[PDB]
Write a protein that binds this ligand. Structure first.
Ligand SMILES: [Ca+2]
Ligand code: NA
Length: 320
């Protein structure tokens, strides 16, 4: 159609937990996003990494993305890429920007748990209540098989337990110590960092945004209730046509009762802050961020496809 999203460097979309480029080689993780961007002049590639793994380490998603980035550069003739990651994908993108600064032009994170997820702490805690530890083995096997079956390439490198640990708040803090970034504020300050970073002589434009559909709206007897602001109260069709809508409202309620404050169901506003924070006001739950569960979203939710398209134009204007 035009070149509204024509960035200088190829855009690589990076999925998070459970992800792959196409679930069962059928359902796109970034629903309708690659198509939209390409129609608007962008060169876009979608990474296919382990849906369950840590980001650092020999078998981690980081080295996987690094290797993938190199194949994209070789195929396009480009020298750098613009990394756009969702959820854990943002942490994976930070890893590549840190170890291979010369291959990255920018890093954009969408609903990325830079400080971990209180829901991860929760799930990890639940498993800890099994004195035999057997549930960790059983559930891991179940989740790992899920990863293999849904992976577009049936990637057998799945480690659900490592993935869970990676997303906890305590581990995330350690990750930030091992992979510092000028785009990050001080731990526990709920502040972002700088809009750019210069690593090894290579400058990166840093961006982020978060979904805050889940808002704490009432507290009684120690219990805190939340409201899904992405939907028209009770009657919104999104509650019926997209099962993740009520599910994230539920996990989001657990989050608020663990002191997370506004969140998207699994990532808090504070945890998602990185680089130039474009917005933390989108009335989105975690999957709305990627136009998911087939493009269904609450009546009060902004268009995620348009938001991403506009960001591509933003990158273009910024020179990357
Ligand atoms: Ca949705
Ligand atoms: Na271009």
């Amino acid at each position: 159609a035009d070149n509204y999203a024509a960035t200088r460097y190829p855009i690589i979309l990076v999925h998070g937990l459970t992800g792959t480029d196409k679930y069962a080689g059928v359902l796109e993780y970034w629903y309708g996003i690659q198509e939209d961007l390409q129609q608007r002049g962008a060169t876009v590639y979608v990474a296919n990494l382990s849906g369950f793994q840590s980001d650092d380490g020999p078998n981690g998603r980081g080295e996987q993305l690094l290797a993938y980035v190199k194949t994209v550069l070789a195929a396009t003739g480009a020298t750098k890429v613009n990394l756009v990651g969702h959820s854990q994908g943002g942490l994976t993108s930070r890893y590549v920007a840190a170890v291979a600064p010369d291959l990255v032009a920018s890093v954009t994170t969408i609903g990325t748990p830079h400080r971990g997820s209180e829901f991860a702490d929760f799930v990890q805690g639940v498993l800890a209540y099994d004195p035999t530890g057997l549930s960790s083995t059983v559930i891991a096997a179940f989740v790992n098989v899920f990863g293999i079956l849904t992976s577009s390439s049936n990637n057998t490198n799945q480690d659900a337990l490592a993935a869970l640990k990676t997303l906890t708040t305590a581990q995330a803090a350690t990750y930030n110590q091992n992979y510092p970034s000028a785009g990050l504020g001080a731990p526990g300050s709920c502040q972002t960092g700088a809009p750019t970073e210069t690593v090894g002589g290579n400058t990166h434009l840093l961006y982020s945004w978060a979904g805050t559909a889940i808002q704490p709206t009432i507290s009684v007897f120690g219990v805190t209730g939340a409201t899904d602001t992405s939907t028209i109260p009770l009657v919104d069709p999104a509650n019926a046509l997209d099962p993740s809508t009520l599910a994230l409202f539920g996990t989001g309620t657990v989050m608020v009762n663990r002191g997370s404050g506004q969140n998207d169901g699994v990532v808090s506003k504070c945890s998602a802050l990185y680089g130039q924070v474009l917005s933390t006001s989108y009335k989105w739950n975690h999957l709305d961020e990627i136009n998911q569960l087939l493009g269904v979203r609450g009546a009060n939710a902004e268009d995620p496809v348009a938001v991403i398209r506009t960001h591509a134009n933003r990158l273009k204007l910024a020179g990357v």
